[PDB]
């Protein structure tokens, strides 16, 4: 069976150097015509080609990143490497290892991809989120929770420890820090009478917070 496996460091800061490994099996890079490459995809973004290396040490690169890239191999160990110098947030992507030959009988195409490896480039120190309740304004009601300025992913969010999943919208985090929001829509008679609480965990910093959403008063 053909398989490819990427390994990376998950998190690294700007200026630093990215070292990515790929470990294949089912074919040899020594085989004449064989080649292995890297393609990436930033979060919810296109697919960008990075580099390819050939069995006979020949190399292809993407012009934009040429001054930052170095693809290399070790065909005795079934491994391809790629270094990216001077990373920055930009480079936060999922990195894919792919097989591609330049001969027909070997498979001139991107048939084989690995699962891929997540690489986040951020300057941030681990930071506990700030969990804010969001009550409706004056005069089926909707409540919200703002989880603000946290690093890294992920946070877990539930309403009444999970007791409430109907009419939940939890929005994907966006960035050096992440922010998150969730909405819950309950029947207009349910709230404020029955309590509704926002439960937020941030494993990385040992954060767990329960915020009751409190009705606005005259004071």
């Amino acid at each position: 069976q053909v398989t490819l496996k990427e390994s990376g460091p998950g998190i690294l800061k700007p200026s630093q150097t990215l070292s990515l490994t790929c470990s294949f099996s089912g074919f040899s890079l020594s085989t004449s015509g064989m080649g292995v490459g890297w393609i990436r995809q930033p979060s919810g973004k296109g697919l960008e080609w990075l580099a390819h290396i050939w069995w006979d040490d020949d190399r292809s690169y993407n012009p934009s990143l040429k001054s930052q890239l170095t693809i290399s191999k070790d065909a005795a160990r079934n491994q391809v490497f790629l270094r990216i110098t001077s990373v920055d947030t930009a480079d936060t992507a999922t990195y894919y290892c792919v097989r591609r030959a330049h001969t027909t009988v070997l498979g001139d195409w991107f048939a084989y991809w690995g699962q891929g490896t997540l690489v986040t480039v951020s300057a941030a120190k681990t930071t506990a989120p700030s969990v804010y309740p969001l009550a409706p304004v004056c005069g089926s009601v909707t409540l919200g929770c703002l989880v603000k300025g946290y690093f890294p992913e992920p946070v877990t969010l539930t309403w009444n420890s999970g007791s409430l999943s109907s009419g939940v919208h939890t929005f994907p985090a966006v960035l050096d820090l992440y922010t998150l929001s969730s909405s819950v829509t309950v029947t207009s008679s349910t709230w404020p009478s029955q309590s509704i609480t926002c439960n937020v965990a941030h494993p990385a910093s040992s954060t767990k917070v329960d915020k009751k959403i409190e009705p606005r008063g005259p004071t």
Binding site: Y132, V137, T142, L146, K148
Partner: peptide
């Protein structure tokens, strides 16, 4: 869209930040 607007929490204000959130569901 069902739209909802929310002022900053007292909690955020207590802490000196100020976010206004809008939901279009």
């Amino acid at each position: 869209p069902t739209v909802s607007i929310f002022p900053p929490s007292s909690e955020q204000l207590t802490s000196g930040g100020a976010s206004v959130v809008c939901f279009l569901n």
